[PDB]
């Protein structure tokens, strides 16, 4: 039941408790710029690494800037992507600030392709929501995500509090299996990201509750120890 | 007791139950072109990729075409060759000549040198059996690889129907562990490989009976996902 | 419990009975020019590739020297060296002037980045103590070790035993969980090294307890077949 995400650089896998459970919805929500798409890509970059398939929905990045930012973090998946082992499905309408608003949320919901690989990203699930044009709403995209997760795939979202009501979002916490919550804090010089896991349902193992990383060029995730 | 295969492009494993256990003979039979040689490339790259060691032995291909046919799959094996992981044994006499006539059987069960690898493949073992000139005859051969997969070794051979009598090939189907039989079929005008698993004598979990595949460049096998989630 | 080191080209993971023990501290004694660090080098690349952490320190060869070394072995290691997934300590001083003096042992004590990683390699420890200047003794570097090695991570040193009195050397080895001994020995006229286990703690399985091999172009440790299959 523990999808592995282990990499030789760092020991994310031990902070976790081993691995991520299988049948995991991951909600990772914070503001801007407090680490959630670098996380997102740390994993994607782990279970790619141990054999697993990805597929990684992006409302902010083409494919192009994509393959930039993880050769950035040295967290490289060009052949994954050549081999189909990574499904890239950059969201134009919402990368190009045009923005309009769609059926996301039906898409997202009825496009067989993504569910097919074992892992399944929306970074930002909380854009598709928040400029979402239907009467699909948040509780049936989170009983959707339950079903898929209820056939052993994991979903990892991000979510932006800022960009939807307080309603919703308490919806989506609810709905998660594994909580985290990220923001930027400053000790001596330094800005760091705080990535705490308010919630842990199916905890493999103990983990740490906090955890503390930076974001370095040509590594990707630095986790501070202790 | 598993044999890991796993790649993160298709799902393979899961669909022969979690991975090959050790000690099988696995034996894939079906016509030319029906897919054989793909598939013993697929799970060959599997094996490497997962730390496994393995000899191909070919009758078909020299170093060259099968580096070119490996890259074209993209499942290059460069490094592989380099370090002896992958020992690859070209049967020239065959390759040069289809119907040219030896000792093959004798060569293939005295080269120590091919089973210090973890898994050993022989495509083809049905040309080698039709073009051997000795006494050594099939139970032989079946008694051979029995002995050395009780070693937990793992053995795969291909066979093309067209090239043995019946009497043979019902002898090889009953020595495999696991059976697979190949083909070709035609759906919506697409022409597809179907791999049928036969028999798989320690299944190690669940499977799929019947594997639909196309050869996909840079790919390899796409499998088809049977169900839709 | 148990640390993997499987690499495809060889098997030395079966000869060590499935891989390192968490928690070990391998001593490697035996004289210049028996294979010491070529073995390091081994198990670094094993443990790196199974998705360990390394720290490398070398008491002999620059990073450049080390990334062409690795590189002459197909151990290459260049992505590890810029992910830091391999920490690689070159000690100048001694690297520069073979007999320079120094708070080695300090160094090597208090600085805690080292010891960040699963597994930490010195290669030499003996010439670190030899050319010590301090208080510090071996006890104490051994309890500090122990102390290292209780977290679950693996410490993994070199001895040259002309370079330390027999009393130090017998403090080590009593202090190892797993000690291998090795030199050089000719047979067909032929060079060979033996790495002998002279004693392994928490053992995880049936062992070999010697392993001959020969250090090859592109392959680096190559392990000569205890038995033919």
């Given at each position: 039941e523990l999808a592995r995400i282990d990499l030789s650089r760092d020991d994310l896998d031990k902070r976790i408790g081993g691995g991520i459970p299988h049948g995991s919805?991951?909600?990772i929500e914070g503001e801007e710029s407090?680490?959630?798409?670098?996380?997102?890509?740390?994993?994607?970059?782990?279970?790619?690494?141990?054999?697993?398939?990805?597929?990684?929905?992006?409302?902010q990045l083409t494919t192009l800037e994509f393959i930039k930012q993880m050769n950035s973090l040295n967290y490289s998946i060009n052949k994954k992507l050549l081999s189909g082992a990574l499904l890239y499905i950059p969201?134009?309408?919402?990368?190009?600030?045009?923005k309009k608003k769609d059926g996301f949320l039906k898409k997202v919901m009825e496009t067989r392709a993504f569910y097919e690989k074992d892992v399944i990203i929306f970074d930002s699930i909380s854009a598709l929501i928040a400029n979402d044009a239907?009467?699909?709403?948040?509780?049936?995209?989170?009983?959707?995500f339950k079903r898929i997760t209820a056939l052993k795939k994991?979903?990892?979202?991000?979510?932006?509090?800022?960009?939807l009501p307080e309603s919703v979002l308490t919806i989506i916490r609810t709905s998660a299996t594994m909580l985290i919550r990220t923001e930027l804090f400053?000790?001596?010089?330094?800005?760091?990201?705080?990535?705490?896991?308010?919630?842990?349902?199916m905890a493999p193992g103990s983990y740490q509750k906090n955890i503390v990383f930076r974001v370095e060029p040509k590594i990707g995730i630095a986790v501070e120890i202790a």
């Amino acid at each position: 039941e523990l999808a592995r995400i282990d990499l030789s650089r760092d020991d994310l896998d031990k902070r976790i408790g081993g691995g991520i459970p299988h049948g995991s919805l991951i909600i990772i929500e914070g503001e801007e710029s407090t680490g959630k798409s670098v996380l997102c890509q740390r994993l994607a970059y782990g279970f790619l690494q141990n054999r697993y398939s990805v597929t990684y929905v992006s409302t902010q990045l083409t494919t192009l800037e994509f393959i930039k930012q993880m050769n950035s973090l040295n967290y490289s998946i060009n052949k994954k992507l050549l081999s189909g082992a990574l499904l890239y499905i950059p969201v134009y309408p919402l990368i190009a600030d045009n923005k309009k608003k769609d059926g996301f949320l039906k898409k997202v919901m009825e496009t067989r392709a993504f569910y097919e690989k074992d892992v399944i990203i929306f970074d930002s699930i909380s854009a598709l929501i928040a400029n979402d044009a239907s009467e699909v709403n948040v509780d049936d995209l989170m009983a959707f995500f339950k079903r898929i997760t209820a056939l052993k795939k994991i979903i990892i979202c991000t979510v932006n509090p800022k960009e939807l009501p307080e309603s919703v979002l308490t919806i989506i916490r609810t709905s998660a299996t594994m909580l985290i919550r990220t923001e930027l804090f400053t000790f001596g010089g330094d800005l760091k990201n705080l990535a705490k896991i308010l919630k842990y349902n199916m905890a493999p193992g103990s983990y740490q509750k906090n955890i503390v990383f930076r974001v370095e060029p040509k590594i990707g995730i630095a986790v501070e120890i202790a």
